[PDB]
Design a protein. Structure first.
Lengths: 168, 178, 168, 178
RNA sequence: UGCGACAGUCGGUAGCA
RNA sequence: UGCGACAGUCGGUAGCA
């Protein structure tokens, strides 16, 4: 049940990196983060991943548990980001603004450790949103750990932050 | 407001409807969502292509949902069907893809699709050039049409200067360049 | 007719580079070199190319006219060199020694600008062969130009060098 | 001379014969050439695998040349056929590939093939490990069997220390290492 | 040599180290 | 900033620049 809980958006290209072997795009990490929200009684969750991650794992962009991506798409949870090769090289469309544009227009929250310095500048109205709605995380081997104070000690609880109606 | 500053728009429906509904299902709903996006943007010239054999009742091997959405768009001079027929029990298809390209090319418009049409880029060089710079990709979020704000790489144009023929709408850039 | 002419071995991985856009593996170059020998009345010609060149053209190892390779294999002229990915990375088997080992055991000549510094050292008996049997080349846009004095002015003519029985 | 210092040898004939003759043709000649190479090297343990349906006369859709070479190698306890049969007009194949692997594994030998057996590496991890370090590839020059002198990368062993069980045969290396 | 550490070309992650 | 020129990881061609 979505008892007053918020839409959720995840920067998968950030999570998978920060989960295992930092240099590796470990899809498992995406799984662990998701399963956490699921077990937390969430319904609306969306992940973003540039599409060229389906491309077979090279040594220059290593990736593990690749089959997890298509499996999450099947549940209308994972969403790929437009990618293609123009003149033999790659065009990406910069997924970063997809994560925000979605969350902004849905009045949700972002799961990522990237501060989006570039986009805070591109649109002041976005800056405010990024300032108040970015949820960071820390990975410990095989457990999703978000902070109990997503903003500073001056900020709100974890439940009053991921819920639109606080329980006061 | 003026629509003459806008570019013609062509949509690969057989790509949209697939990518909207559980991939293996031809969900016409998406086509409606994609179009309405352009409409709200002040659009007049919009054209969709769909191989005609989709009017056939939803079979178990080629499932389709909300089938009646098609006739409503043809009635609006927006959807256009592509020739199909049965020769000796098989289907003739005429490959809708090149209808999408030929038109957008001949109208100097843009194509909406996630298919790169690699096969057609090779057959005609001038087409390749056009597809490279005039293909608009998208991403569907359940019931939300999301095109990229940078249809080409960061070095390329805005979504509006690419989706509009007069690109001179005031630009704002930073950085000292070479 | 093979009127006393020698077996021919070509370092394709060297030719294709040196033909067009030095940084590009231009298969056309292989074609031009071959066609030259063909028009010269040659029968035994063999080219070597590590197999991973069939892999689609990346920006990091660009290659053009890729379909020319399989087309030359069909004529029992092109030969691929064993390649595979062990642990996600590439193993190559170092084609260089295939070109020599073949030419040595066939008493032919090598077409390449590489001096094989490493192999002259690995086997002295090979060094002698490399010294006397390496034919260099120079590419001018779309024409195969070998030297009329494959060795120094002190050395032999082009025909007496690519033919085992000299015409004296 | 001693052959006990040698490793068991297994050959994927359906890969060799193909790659020798015009790819689409099953040229048994190659198998002979490949084997004789090992023989001249002082070999005793050599074993080949071939799906049995190759004894069927050369059909136009599955061409084969020098078919009689097969029986001669079976007669020599070198070639071994792999189970095949026709169920209801179709063929049952039993997938010769895993016969090659299981044996070489169980004999602690090496495999001669250009197929990486990716599918089998996944089914059994211990096999993957073995295939990575025990697959010997080759290259055919018309009528010449050429295996690499470095079956693994330059960092790996010689062709002989990989093709022999006792690797200690005097080594000569240069370079100061870490 | 010694094949790297580097010289050109180029990709993934970093917003200054 | 400014995204590069660079910092880590890494590939193709070079035998010393
Ligand atoms: C191994 As050295 C000191 O010649 O670069
Ligand atoms: C563009 As600058 C001088 O801040 O590196
Ligand atoms: Mg990013
Ligand atoms: Mg199509
Ligand atoms: Mg080389
Ligand atoms: Mg096989």
């Amino acid at each position: 049940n979505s008892d007053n809980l918020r839409p959720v958006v995840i920067d998968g290209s950030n999570v998978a990196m920060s989960h295992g072997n930092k240099e590796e795009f470990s899809c498992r990490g995406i799984q662990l983060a998701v399963d956490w929200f699921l077990d937390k009684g969430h319904k609306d969750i969306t992940v973003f991943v540039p599409a060229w991650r389906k491309e077979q794992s090279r040594p220059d962009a290593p990736i593990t548990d690749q089959d997890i991506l298509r499996k999450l798409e099947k549940e209308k949870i994972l969403v790929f980001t437009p990618s293609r090769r123009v003149q033999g090289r790659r065009v990406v469309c910069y997924d970063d603004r997809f994560i925000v544009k979605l969350a902004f227009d849905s009045d949700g929250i972002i799961v990522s450790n990237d501060n989006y310095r570039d986009l805070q500048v591109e649109k002041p109205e976005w800056k405010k949103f990024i300032e108040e709605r970015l949820l960071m995380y820390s990975f410990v081997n095989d457990k999703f750990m978000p902070p109990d104070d997503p903003l500073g000690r001056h900020g709100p609880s974890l439940e009053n932050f991921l819920r639109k109606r606080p329980i006061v």
